Symmetry: C4
Subunit: 271 residues, 4 copies
């Protein structure tokens, strides 16, 4: 229909995107002011109306997309499903889930990432990096779990505040891994009772920082490459061979054209 064709290009406009962006920025600002409890009841009830106004503009925007693209088409995008769920969960009377409350209205500012393409591409790159840093994250999860059981068994009886149980131990080890007070605060006290506790903790620190760093560098590097490669496909429309693939074959392609040149010289010299 003509209604769904005109809707679509209204939705695809820069000023429509800019209207939605200023509505996200407005809802963000009013939720930030709402943290001020020194405000008068008049001001508090005023900002809650600005919140409802912002929320209804999103219900309108998301419904206009569902109509113009279809249910099959709108839900075909991960960023549209996120944009939907953000607004869809704001209209709910206590769903059957083990949550305390859905008072995280400020998670609406997260829509700024999806609405702004530059940030949507940046986040997108980091999301695609995660699968190819799955084995390292798993190795790190094993290393902690073994360290959490060891620490609870070794020190939970003498230092129950920090190694009282397995949950407590996972927390203290996360702290020791972030080098936060690990020595003056944890290991030095533990060492008075257990004089060789450094045998356990220095290797835990060495191992977890090498892995966390390998996990982070792995994400930052792949995401930076994925982003540039997506920009080339978005500009030229042609599929972009990943740089690692180009590098792994660079040797093969140079020695193929070395032999091709020498065999052309073979036919040329003898004529």
């Amino acid at each position: 229909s003509h209604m769904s064709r005109k809707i679509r290009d209204l939705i695809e406009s820069k000023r429509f995107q800019n209207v939605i962006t200023a509505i996200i920025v407005l809802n963000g600002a009013v939720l930030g002011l709402l943290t001020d409890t020194t405000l008068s009841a008049s001001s508090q009830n005023l900002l809650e109306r600005v919140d409802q106004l912002c929320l209804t503009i999103f219900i309108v925007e998301i419904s206009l997309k569902i109509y113009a693209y279809g249910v099959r088409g709108f839900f075909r995008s991960g960023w549209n499903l996120f944009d939907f769920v953000i607004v869809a969960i704001a209209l709910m009377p206590a769903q059957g889930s083990l949550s305390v409350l859905r008072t995280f209205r400020i998670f609406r500012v997260m829509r700024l990432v999806s609405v702004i393409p530059t940030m949507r591409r940046v986040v997108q790159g980091m999301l695609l990096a995660l699968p190819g840093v799955g084995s390292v994250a798993a190795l790190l999860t094993v290393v902690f779990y073994i360290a959490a059981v060891m620490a609870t068994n070794l020190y939970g009886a003498t230092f129950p505040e920090w190694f009282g149980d397995l949950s407590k131990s996972l927390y203290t080890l996360f702290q020791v891994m972030t080098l936060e007070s690990w020595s003056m605060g944890i290991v030095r006290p533990v060492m008075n009772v257990h004089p060789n506790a450094w045998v356990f903790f220095i290797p835990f620190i060495m191992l977890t920082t090498l892995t966390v760093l390998n996990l982070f560098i792995g994400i930052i590097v792949d995401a930076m490459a994925i982003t540039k490669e997506q920009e080339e496909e978005a500009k030229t429309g042609h599929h972009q061979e990943p740089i690692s693939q180009t590098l792994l074959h660079l040797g093969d392609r140079l020695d193929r054209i070395e032999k091709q040149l020498a065999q052309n010289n073979e036919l040329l010299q003898r004529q």
Copy 2:
């Protein structure tokens, strides 16, 4: 005129640059001594004259450039505008701005960066890197802002010193992000009152350190490439294709010359 031609090459000399450099180093040293309040009034009034002497030599230097290059030409360089504003703001009787005082005379040592070309190129590289780390810095700004609102709402009532308001929360979160006392100092105390506060803080730490690192690596990498690419254009005078562009097309250029070689072999074999 001949006056503007001789001026220009005096200004473009190595010993003129070296004179200005020793004047910046002299003003820097006298401002550093001026921090000593144990000095006698004779010594204090002596150093303030050395400061005025240094400042007038800059008024002379900057005026000689304005004449020899012109207003259109001198203000065409960003480094010359900075060199101008540094001296121009030192001759001002309380401008209409919300500043406390312009007692930051030591910001004159910043001219050492502009006067010394090696450092002017190094800083220049970092300035050009910033635009292409704009999306990440924006993502980080959103992540804090959401975390600042969440922390003020969750903990500002029980721990007002650290999450009393939104400003206070931005500060504590910056501290938690720099891993500074985050656990023994902030989260462990918060956890006595709110037993699951780690659900909020460990992901905040994980997320903000991955982004800050991605923001820093993005700057350091692009700046290092931009600097080397500018050095090639400064040496050869020819435009330098950015390394990312060379890498993204390396595959295409190798398979083009593979086909070109094989098609030349096609015409050669059949003759």
Copy 3:
């Protein structure tokens, strides 16, 4: 024999790997629950039987591999020797070694790395990186040892808790290197007695962080390359030229084909 041929492909199946994986995950979980001392004697003796059950399934699995591959063949793999020693040391009545006890049953979860190929490849990459970060690790070991002797001689008499002996000094320096309370906790106190101790500690910090970082970046970079290069050999079966070798010769190979093209043009123009 036909028994050793059928065994081998049972062992090489995905569901056999998945059975062993769920047995490792089960033994891991029961060892984690065993850390709970609030449990009843009935529950404690129940989990120890689940532990023995898991351990016997590994004795069966490892014996089935020893038979189907042979002793010469099974012990030809480093990952199989590790898988063997993990189970072989669990059946031992106090071997002649200077250990306290072999109560580290949770080191069985380490088999998840070997049993899961994705993680076995990830760890494998880090193990192969170590030899080519041997010189840096040695430089770091020399730097500490000299710093440990210097600190014990300078400060062990005045601050015996931290520099009492050489062992104590190695520990405090490891702490200072991880920037843990180095100033408010160690150097500031030391400086009251020895006003220029910063001359010793700031360079120690500068030097050890540059080396530890060079040691870590060296591992993370080589491991990431080794892993990708092993994946290419595993996919194509052909030997993969290391990227550093490709890069060091890239110049030579381009100027060889430049000359080969120009010499073919030499024979072509004159015909």
Copy 4:
């Protein structure tokens, strides 16, 4: 002469290097034991003789090199001059210098770096990296110096322990830059008196960590490349074009051979 020819190849042997290495390791160990003040006077005077024995073996070794290579030839190597000065300063009766004492005999273990080629190459790479991280280190030195003057002027009157003078301020800022207690320990206390001190400190932290990281990554990256490039020249004897030079011209060399191939096809098609 024949004496200088036989000496030279004794000195160039692997077992001569191994003898010197075990003498360095022996002197290192005896200096480490000498830190133990609980030792008996018999043991203390025994180890000082082992120290003199080690020192004389170095006087013999260094004199054998001076004779076999000459003074012009021996002092032509930076590693030989270091090896000389290490031993030459151990035979000195209080030279005219502003030092406290030359009780740093453990700086002899530093000879292990020079004597062992693998480490001598590793250190060598880091030394050659320094010049090309000179501009960044200078930028960092300017940033601190300006921050040291600003902090002393702003806070030295209210917080003299930390910003009492310019020296004191350089130290506190180095601490704030290493994120050591910067907030709970320095900025939070300072903020009670000066409520907007975070305006000064958060940017100081942001700026100094980006630069220190750029300074460190710059060293680690160039040193890793310099080392691999020196290994290629040591293996092949041919000069190695630096990877940055190869990369900056890779585009030019590919489009030169693209045109050379197409112009050969031009002459081939028309024949």
